[PDB]
Symmetry: C2
Subunit: 995 residues, 2 copies
């Protein structure tokens, strides 16, 4: 009865999809044609009719209740939400208003043109049933070509809103026409429509938040998440369908959008499996419904064949294209007025794009089957089948021509040269590997002609004067922006940036590239991270100011007692026992209030509210029983902490992105100067570019520091989160290196990987994002301070705390080095001889003045009320004299300042090409310095060391008698290093032994 | 009616699974207890009964038809087949015979003990329903501990055969007992049982091969094959259910096993999705069935509560454990007699392991609901519920104690020290990264106490004399075997070995380690690759000897005409038209035979068969109409090539593994000698170990070369396949390096990686595995020969071909260099002053005598009838003199010999640790040598070069007046290289410039 048709439909869909991949037309039109010829055969041969009747004439209710929600949820689950939510207002207003105007114009045109005796409800049904779309076919081509991501996102996100609101309009009008017994009074109808509008999406959002909350607490598991997510989706659909007739699909689409939004709380394997499963289900539904529409349109087309009917179909297709063009043109200036308008080229390609799909045919078969023995269903089905096959041929065939006529199909010259370079490098490497393989013992037998023929990759992208000064400046600007984009991509690949920050940086860089003589401004980035101050911040401040046997479990039990007491009154809003347990609960709350009175009753407002509620409880009968429930309001004093935590989480989510953007920009600017130092020629050009980059760096650093200063309760959390993520990433890299080296077996490596993944997932939702730091922990947390509690106590006894107001000056250039400084709260500016910098909490000032005892070379200007920790120089000297263990503290000072003074030198020499700041820092950290006292102030360079750098002292080469000042790198030319008894300038070296 | 119960079951399963992960007992027992209390509540409160009736009392047919096949197919799909198929006979005989003896003993015990008025049919139905197992809870723990993979594979593969035979026996005897109208005659019953035995699995194999053949021809797709595979599984089940009542599950399990076997023809994403989906479906079935058994056993336990019944249950559990132990003990010596026996410890842990699962309760509920209003169903359900809960408690709780009492739970000391070293390295690296992060500007604010504490990984494991000479020899042997295992793991990780070859090598290495004073023999490896000569080879030889307008579409159309002519006669085995089209086909075949007679009719046997068939066609009526179909035998002449291709594919599949094992061993032996040179101290020890390793090296190389010589038609294909795979892997590595460097955008990198994957998938099933190579292609295919067709033609004109028989000597040591030799066919041995070697096709001999014109240093002895190419030395000299382009041929000779002479020097000095031969060969390939003539025979070492090696000539240092012979590496100490006009010994250098 059923099995033959479904198996044949799956086979035919498989064949057509696998065979029309290269062809331009989509695979669906040939599916429709196969369904048509199957319908002809079933009309002729009775056995095919017997095997077709049970599924072609399907009960329309199961169609409208099963096939539609799967398709809508798939189209919801398909995309990303960030691009959608970033441009939600545009697509929402466009979809809604275009849909309603298309429906009404198509309806009135049907009245004016068809010469049928159709009432208004049928005409609105017609307009709403040919307004559904399916941009899948095109959006795939647009994403493949990659002309514009915003256009593809807009044309693909129009689909959901269009289909959902078309379904809703169809549902209300179908209930109006085919079920006449339903009352069409104004008040009930508007109440029902408002219910559809609000009760659907809110219910979907509620269940989405509930299931995300349950899902975030499941660790190292996969089978639980899949079943609970599928159950959540199905129960949302079932509840939505039980309460309302049509709001279920809206609840499902909003649930899908939200559960796709919170991607970080689901393991990647679970989400990729879920995407694949929903996609397979949708594809099966699509194939089966197209078979069904083909057979049912063939079996019922001989009763409505008419030449003027074909003329009506043709002019209807022309009319609907015209109407879509007209509404897009009408809304183009209004959409341009919002600051996020679209080009006319985008408008025309998007109105010619977009075409009918499976949704229209689903609703059409619903109409046809509900119509029964009438011509109205045949007219509906014939018209919609004609328009869908017509657009599936015409638009999906000529869309490539429309792309090629306009400038969208063109490929940028930089992308072409990138392709040429990449393919040349790939070809050269493959040729080199082939030459190497031809020299081996084992593989010389293989015939290399077929071998080389088999392996080949082609090109997918091809088959003095002031005017001279301006041209050189433009060339430098272009290469500047290219190098900055390269650094951004490299740093994203290594993994210190989130995807959103990289997308923002790339968009800003390409916008600056498109604009003439415009660099990357900071004002746009300032607006990017300056979303901190919004009405949520005012709400947080208000909530902070409203809030202020003593175990926490006491009030926890009070809250759960209130929760259980909710049930009897909410059932009332058995009587004798209910009153008795009410009396028992009243007595329990009375003794709880007595205990609270024993705790000095210091509560301000909740005490008054509890007193009022107790007065009500201890004290027209129906009204009193209805209004004796204000005790429900007592839970809000426990609901406030949850709200302040969630608003803190929100502000954390914003601040993390804003912080990452600044960090990526500052790293890129730091590296690109050393990039351009190897390239630039004109002195004025390099001076101007360096000045501009330094100005941007200073502005960004100062603004970010002030933003951190504004409220540290979130900056502390986000910085700790980033630090722990970095540590776990490097531990995972070390684990994989050990696995590749073979020293760790595969099972143990998998166990270690599992532990690391568990730690990272615990990180993903562990902190409350509000850790307050104390200053003494900051003093004891310094790198060289750590490792000796005795030295920590000595410093803490000998440290001093100073406080300064805005605009003051702490130390000036050339003054005597009174001691080492340690900033513990605030922000400060450091200006000294040309260069300028900004220092924040967690740094120290002036290690030269306490190690080399040289005069200061900077000036310190306070920017806010700063708290600083101060150690006198003589105390540092006596601490150096006291502690002389193997990890000597002064050795730690020299190591730290050596790293800080050697990283810029290495990056200037650019010795480690393709290395970020982190890798160079780690490589220099692996090294250690060795004392020259035990080696007679002579050092021999061996092959074990990789890089050597001298920090202080005068380097005397044993051979050739070369005198080298400090600090600078020494190459492999020097073989022996010699020093004498130079107490005035103590020599200091640094070596990096390789393995 | 249904939704509440299924949703609650899914919720309860998720909660119990997520909450009993740390607890030792499985979640299933608490699932059963929750079902039991739900049954109590449903018995008490009528509303719960109303919501339970529709699923608790489910129609037994849908249970037995839906729940069982999903579980069996999941258990089949879970395992890997290679370990199963490698030990298939053991598990097959054990499961079958243990099942039948368990059934019969349980039956006779039921008669002897229960004092029930049961017949033998019910008793052995009970025995079959108690023999089903579910070792998932035990196999998961055993794989977690990893004592023995063979034991886990055996105990987990016993499950499939045990369940399949149990369900078959249940089906047949349940149909006997509950449907008495079925005839129990001997002949029909044995025919039905034979049908169940054979027609199921062969049908499954047929559909598995068909679907694998369809799926191997689908490229770059991800949705078509998922639906194809699911439809294939469902249609196999449906056809199996139509034809036979029970063989469907056997068809399904064999289909799952085969489709899991051919893993390489399916994309990894699709297979992981399919695994996850089937696993989720099975888990849902398990949870629902345990809820259902709980509620039905609670609602129907008050009619069979009896103290002696509980006593019967207890002694039944004891009896079934005793019987399982007895059968395992009985079959232990017979299984030891096959050479693959098991220890008594494995036997006892496996008989105490294994426990009842979902299959038993499924069949139990089938019995219960088919019984109706009787006590027999209650007794069945009570007994099986009691035994399943009893074993899920006792065995799943005490299995860890059984592991800890025996020596299986112990951890090897080498694994403990490896874990300690890995965790120490991880901790050190994490500490270093933390120290680096504490020095940054941005992240100094984060409170490091909560940071470090969070990210911490802990060891998950712990919480003169001859006797001296023997001890050092044993220590050296253990170090050698550890290093060989390390090299095998590293080479597998880089990717020149298949998984199976690595598994074989690791097993052989650990077996040699366990055995005292035993190294890795070659006889076992010889037997490993010596599976070439089996009855498949004899069949291939027989098929080769039987087989010998001419366009091939003519015979293709003849074949399809025969295929279409199959249908009318097979429908006969409308009449007038059938006879007329038979006459038309006869006339067409007659003119085809006339054309064949025009082609000299040289066919030996098929001509006679065609003549006989034509005589039959041109010529008791029923017998003639039945026997006029022998024309169907004409297709075998076209079926033979397909069978010879498939047997060639089989021998290719064997030889690829046999070749990979040898290649891995040879690389390991090449590397272990060098790395043991850095550890050994005693001269006699190193001499003996080097001699043994060299003996194994020589034996393996000679044997592999002879194996290649045996039939080149497969060796050519496998070597070309390996070469193309290597080239594609290095191209993908270069693509990913470009993506990491940022020079290629992510879209284009994805496109290139997709093209690479397409090429790999085309490789996976492209070749026919029989490419024959010509010798002139071997001459023109040499590395330095290529690049000049003029030089190729000059060589081909001037080359000579020589042929030699076995045992002859071509050249001897110390003779004048007559010229260069090029081996093109055969195998030769090279012995010269101590070292010995074997050479095969595609190599050349003696570049010294043609470059340096020095006397030969080797002796060449033929091992078979060899064809060789010979070029006279004077012709090589005149070819050098003729061609003096920038890529000079003599420069190519020097480059090739420099690589071949510099790689062993790099290995001996061991400069680049952690690299295999491939990486060092690639690194040396990038380098290029520079002529000293244009640089006044003096060279300056700069920082661009990475490593320099001198091949020929005397190295004169400008400084310190140092003389260096050749060939040896020069360190960074030397800065300037000098040479004079030395015509007798031409200086030759080689440098590797870094980037
Ligand atoms: C509901 C609509 C029923 C219409 C009435 C109808 O025809 O019912 C008929 C029964 O028909 C069925 O049993 C239909 C439901 C079975 C299909 C469910 C597929 C689930 C897809 C997977 C979703 C997985 C969960 C989410 C992932 C009979 O009723 P009648 O003919 O009216 O008499």
């Amino acid at each position: 009865k059923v099995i033959v048709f479904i198996s044949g439909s799956c086979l035919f869909g498989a064949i057509s999809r696998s065979l029309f991949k290269k062809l331009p037309i989509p695979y669906t039109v040939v599916l429709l044609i196969l369904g048509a010829i199957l319908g002809v055969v079933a009309s002729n041969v009775p056995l095919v009719e017997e095997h077709t009747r049970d599924v072609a004439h399907m009960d329309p209710h199961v169609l409208l209740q099963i096939f539609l929600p799967v398709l809508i949820f798939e189209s919801a689950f398909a995309m990303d939400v960030h691009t959608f939510m970033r441009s939600f207002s545009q697509v929402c207003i466009l979809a809604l208003f275009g849909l309603v105007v298309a429906s009404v114009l198509t309806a009135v045109l049907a009245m004016n043109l068809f010469n049928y005796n159709w009432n208004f409800s049928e005409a609105m049904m017609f307009g709403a049933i040919m307004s559904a779309t399916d941009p899948v076919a095109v959006v795939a081509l647009l994403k493949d070509l990659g002309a514009s991501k915003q256009l593809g996102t807009i044309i693909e996100g129009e689909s959901l809103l269009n289909d959902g609101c078309a379904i809703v309009i169809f549902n209300v009008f179908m209930k109006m026409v085919f079920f006449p017994q339903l009352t069409s009074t104004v008040g009930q109808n508007v109440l029902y429509f408002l219910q559809v509008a609000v009760a659907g999406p809110l219910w979907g959002y509620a269940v989405a938040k509930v299931t995300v909350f349950f899902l975030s607490h499941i660790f190292n598991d996969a089978l639980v998440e899949i079943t609970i997510t599928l159950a959540a989706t199905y129960l949302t659909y079932y509840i939505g369908d039980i309460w309302l007739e049509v709001s279920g699909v809206l609840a499902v689409v909003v649930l899908g959008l939200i559960v796709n939004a919170e991607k970080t709380s689901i393991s990647p394997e679970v989400e990729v499996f879920l995407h694949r499963f929903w996609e397979m289900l949708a594809y099966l539904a699509n194939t089966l419904i197209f078979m069904m529409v083909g057979v049912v349109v063939t079996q019922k087309a001989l009763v409505a064949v008419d030449k003027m009917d074909w003329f009506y179909l043709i002019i209807l297709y022309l009319a609907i294209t015209i109407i879509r063009g007209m509404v897009i043109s009408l809304f183009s200036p209004i959409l341009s007025r919002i600051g996020y308008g679209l080009t006319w080229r985008n408008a025309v390609i998007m109105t010619w794009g977009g075409l009918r799909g499976a949704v229209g045919l689903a609703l059409a078969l619903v109409v046809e089957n509900l119509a029964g023995n009438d011509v109205i269903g045949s007219k509906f089905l014939f018209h919609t089948a004609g328009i869908v096959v017509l657009t599936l041929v015409i638009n999906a065939t000529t869309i490539q021509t429309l792309l090629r006529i306009l400038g969208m199909s063109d490929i940028s010259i930089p992308k072409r040269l990138a392709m040429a370079g990449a393919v040349r490098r790939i070809h050269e490497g493959q040729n080199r590997t082939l030459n190497m393989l031809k020299s081996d013992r084992f593989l010389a037998d293989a015939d290399w002609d077929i071998a080389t023929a088999a392996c080949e990759i082609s090109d997918p992208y091809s088959a003095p004067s002031p005017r001279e000064f301006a041209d050189m400046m433009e060339e430098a600007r272009l290469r500047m922006l290219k190098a900055e984009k390269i650094s951004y991509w490299k740093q994203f690949e290594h993994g210190m940036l989130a995807r959103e920050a990289l997308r923002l940086l790339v968009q800003h860089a390409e916008v600056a590239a498109d604009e003439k003589d415009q660099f990357i401004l900071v004002d746009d980035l300032k607006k990017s991270w300056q979303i901190k101050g919004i009405y949520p911040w005012l709400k947080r401040k208000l909530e902070d100011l409203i809030s202020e046997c003593h175990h926490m479990a006491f009030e926890v039990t009070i809250n759960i007692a209130i929760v259980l007491n909710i049930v009897p009154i909410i059932m009332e809003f058995a009587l004798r026992i209910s009153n008795y347990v009410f009396f028992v609960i009243y007595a329990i709350e009375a003794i709880v209030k007595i205990l609270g009175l024993g705790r000095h009753y210091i509560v301000s407002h909740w005490n008054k509210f509890d007193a009022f509620i107790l007065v009500v409880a201890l004290v027209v009968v129906k009204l009193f029983r209805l209004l004796r429930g204000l005790r429900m309001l007592r839970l809000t004093k426990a609901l406030i902490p949850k709200l302040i935590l969630v608003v803190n989480g929100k502000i954390n989510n914003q601040l993390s992105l804003g912080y990452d953007v600044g960090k990526g920009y500052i790293i890129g600017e730091e590296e690109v100067g050393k990039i351009i130092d190897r390239m630039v020629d004109n002195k004025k050009i390099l001076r101007e570019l360096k000045h501009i980059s330094e100005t941007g760096r200073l502005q960004v650093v100062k603004e970010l520091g002030l933003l951190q200063r504004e409220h540290p309760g979130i900056a502390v959390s986000v910085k700790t989160r980033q630090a722990i993520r970095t540590i776990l990433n490097h531990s995972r890299e070390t684990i994989h290196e050990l696995q590749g080296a073979g020293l760790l077996d595969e099972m143990e490596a998998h166990k270690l990987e599992l532990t690391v993944e568990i730690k990272m997932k615990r990180l993903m939702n562990a902190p409350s994002s509000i850790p307050p730091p104390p200053p003494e922990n900051l003093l004891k947390n310094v790198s060289w301070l750590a490792g000796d509690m005795k030295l920590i106590d000595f410093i803490k006894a000998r440290a001093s705390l100073l406080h300064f107001d805005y605009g003051e000056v702490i130390v000036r250039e050339g003054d005597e080095s009174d001691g080492l400084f340690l900033i513990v709260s605030g922000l400060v500016k450091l200006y000294g001889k040309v260069f300028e910098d900004y220092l924040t909490v967690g740094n120290v000032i002036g290690e030269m003045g306490v190690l080399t005892k040289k005069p200061r070379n900077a000036t310190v200007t306070c920017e806010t009320t700063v708290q600083v920790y101060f150690i006198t120089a003589e105390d540092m000297n006596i601490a150096i004299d006291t502690f002389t263990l193997y990890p000597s503290l002064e050795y730690r000072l020299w190591r730290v300042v050596a790293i800080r003074i050697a990283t810029p030198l290495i990056m200037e020499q650019m010795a480690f090409q393709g290395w970020t700041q982190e890798k160079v820092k780690l490589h220099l950290e692996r090294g250690y310095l060795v004392d020259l006292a035990e080696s007679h102030f002579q050092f021999n360079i061996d092959a074990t060391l990789e890089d050597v750098i001298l920090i202080n002292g005068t380097a005397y080469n044993a051979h050739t008698r070369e005198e080298i000042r400090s600090p600078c790198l020494i190459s492999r030319t020097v073989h022996k290093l010699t020093f004498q008894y130079t107490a005035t300038e103590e020599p200091r070296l640094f070596v990096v032994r390789n393995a």
